[PDB]
Ligand binder design. Structure first.
Ligand SMILES: CC(=O)SCCNC(=O)CCNC(=O)[C@H](O)C(C)(C)COP(=O)(O)OP(=O)(O)OC[C@H]1O[C@@H](n2cnc3c(N)ncnc32)[C@H](O)[C@@H]1OP(=O)(O)O
Length: 214
């Protein structure tokens, strides 16, 4: 429900071996078709969340009316093959004066690893959080995920700051067993962060908005 347990799955060639460019486009999951495709990517990376739990987590955005709120899943698609390259699922929270985002799911797909798409998607999330009204991105980080989030600049949330939202967090946020709570404040995100992450993704050009839309 709001508790989980990260169980990761354990010869893999690069699908970007060609000269490029490889055109790619970001998308928001808005159809059952995209929902199925993102769940398929996740299901090859996770043992738990299992198939039912991925279907509970990856959903169409709320049919509501004024700030961003609720669940959103974005993906990056490789246009040559229509394959999903990576995907993130968030929950957007507005609690009293606290406006923040949590990230239950994040993965890069088979054949696309170690190309910079993880850094790129994280950069696109932080840029979206800045542009919408969010103050920070909060991560429930299983022991196996801490080094990754840490490398990308998330830090262990200080206890005094967690205690300010601890009640709302324990009752509303998606908590992985044994996790550490990590955080990046959006005021620390550089304006050129997406530009620099994309520059590092070799042989890729992005068509459409270079970032996440809602
Ligand atoms: C659901 C959750 O929230 S769990 C959080 C993580 N998700 C998962 O574990 C799902 C399965 N794993 C994956 O999908 C991938 O291994 C990911 C998403 C962790 C990383 O995807 P990649 O495509 O390897 O990321 P990318 O190539 O963009 O790497 C970004 C940078 O992080 C580094 N990095 C990648 N994985 C790790 C790791 N596990 N620990 C530390 N650093 C890492 C890379 O070396 C790279 O460094 P650089 O930019 O300084 O050169």
């Amino acid at each position: 429900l709001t508790y989980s347990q990260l169980v990761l799955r354990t010869d893999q060639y690069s699908k970007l071996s060609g000269d490029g460019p490889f055109p790619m486009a970001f998308g928001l999951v808005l159809s059952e078709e995209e929902r199925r495709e993102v769940i398929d990517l996740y299901s090859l990376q996770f043992q738990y969340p299992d198939q039912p739990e991925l279907q509970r987590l990856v959903i169409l955005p709320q049919t509501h009316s004024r700030r961003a709120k609720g669940s959103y899943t974005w993906y990056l698609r490789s246009l040559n093959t229509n394959e999903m390259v990576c995907a993130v699922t968030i929950m957007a929270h507005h609690y009293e004066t606290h406006h923040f985002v949590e990230v239950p799911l994040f993965a890069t797909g088979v054949g696309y690893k170690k190309h910079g798409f993880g850094r790129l998607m994280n950069a696109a999330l932080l840029q979206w959080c800045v542009e919408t009204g969010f103050e920070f991105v909060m991560i429930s980080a299983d022991v196996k995920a801490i080094p990754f989030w840490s490398h990308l600049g998330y830090k262990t949330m200080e206890k005094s700051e967690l205690t300010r939202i601890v009640f709302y967090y324990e009752h509303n946020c998606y908590k992985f067993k044994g996790a550490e709570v990590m955080i990046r404040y959006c005021r620390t995100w550089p304006t050129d962060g997406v530009k620099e992450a994309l520059a590092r993704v070799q042989k890729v050009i992005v068509s459409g908005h270079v970032g996440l839309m809602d």
